[PDB]
Amino acid sequence: EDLLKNLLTMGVDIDMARKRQPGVFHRMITNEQDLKMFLLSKGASKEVIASIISRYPRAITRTPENLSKRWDLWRKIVTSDLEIVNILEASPESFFRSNNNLNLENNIKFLYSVGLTRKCLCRLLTNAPRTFSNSLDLNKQMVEFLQAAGLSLGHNDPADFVRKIIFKNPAILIQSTKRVKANIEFLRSTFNLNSEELLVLICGPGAEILDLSNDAARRSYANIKEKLFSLGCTEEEVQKFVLSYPDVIFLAEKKFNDKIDCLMEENISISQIIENPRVLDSSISTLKSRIKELVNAGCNLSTLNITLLSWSKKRYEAKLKKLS
DNA sequence: ATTACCGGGCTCTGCCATCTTA
DNA sequence: TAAGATGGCAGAGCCCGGTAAT
């Protein structure tokens, strides 16, 4: 009824909220006012609250008992209200897209029993909140699948493989198994990878690779192959390269290319680059910036030791002084 | 004194499709 | 019989510095 009037004064973007969830507005009763007070209660700015309601209107259909309970459960993981408020601003949907607090609490219990610690749970909640709106079964599925792969490979105790992979890759429990499986079969195929190496890779330097959408790695890698073949690198050199620094897969196609090009526009050979993969850690912006400083001081670059382009500001700025 | 090796920090959606639900 | 509740999906890097090595 007076719904819209409320929202409007709250700062809500109604037109957008209607597009997202028309249903919420065909509701006789809604608790948009209790919500405002609750979030105001817990530190939330007036503008955050508007923003949160504008992205997930169904949030206003929650009761103060319900909100206070779920909030309280989050506080079993995170230590401050501020932490929580920030997670909610970044990702409203994780807090509000379920009202099933028993599941949440069973979810938390389960995650503990899998041998995860609180520090790890706080890390999931912080960096992959959507985990805690996952159904218990869902988190079960993923965890079970990881154990059943910890075993399908050399690994002794999956109950520890699982912990490693999560510390490294918190967002894992909010990937589908369709996705994660496809990413393993991809690394396994693409690099004729034994059971153990593949294992190490996936817990370590290539952990995030499992988070890529369908065909994203196949496509990103394909492009790496093409871009490096075009410059006289053999397949082996390409593979040695990516395996030595798998995260280069995560880069979007054009960023990898743009990145290679700026480097070579300077007489930096492709040999220099692939033998020092980490120089690609830098943003193009940072590279370019440094490249200027260094061509300025009469550096060559074709003959320089370019590992410095990816050194911390501290160790880079220092070496630069000396070059004057 | 100076570089290499290598792993850690930080990482936190927003939309649609398909069920349940009451 | 129309909402809620759930699952799934496209999208995709940069910087730091402890410590071994020279």
What's the helix-strand series?
A: HHHHHHHHHHHHHHHHHHHH
The number of distinct structural domains comes to 1
Major sheet description? none
> How many beta-strand segments?
0
Question: Regarding quaternary structure, how should these chains be classified?
Answer: monomer
Shape: globular
Helix content: 55-70%
Family: Belongs to the mTERF family.
Protein name: Transcription termination factor 1, mitochondrial
Keywords: DNA-binding, Mitochondrion, Phosphoprotein, Repeat, Transcription, Transcription regulation, Transcription termination, Transit peptide
Subunit structure: Monomer.
Entry keywords:
324 residues, mainly alpha, 20 helices, 62% helix, 0% strand, DNA-binding, transcription, RNA binding, double-stranded DNA binding, Transcription termination factor 1, mitochondrial
List the helices and strands and how they pair.
Layout lengths: L2 H8 L3 H7 L1 H4 L6 H10 L4 H10 L8 H11 L6 H10 L1 H5 L4 H13 L4 H10 L8 H15 L7 H11 L8 H14 L4 H9 L12 H14 L5 H9 L9 H12 L5 H5 L9 H13 L16 H10 L2
The structure holds a DNA duplex (22 and 22 nucleotides).
Q: Could you explain the architecture of this structure?
A:
With 324 residues, the protein is mostly helical. It has one domain. Helix content is 62%, strand content 0%. The chain contains 20 helices and no strands. The protein has helices spanning 3-10, 14-20, 22-25, 32-41, 46-55, 64-74, 81-90, 92-96, 101-113, 118-127, 136-150, 158-168, 177-190, 195-203, 216-229, 235-243, 253-264, 270-274, 284-296, 313-322. The longest helix is centred in the middle third of the chain and has 15 residues, at 136-150. The chain starts with a helix and ends with a helix. The structure holds a DNA duplex (22 and 22 nucleotides). Its main location: mitochondrion. Belongs to the mTERF family. Residues 97-98, 175-179, 252-259, 283-286, 312-319 are annotated as: Interaction with DNA.
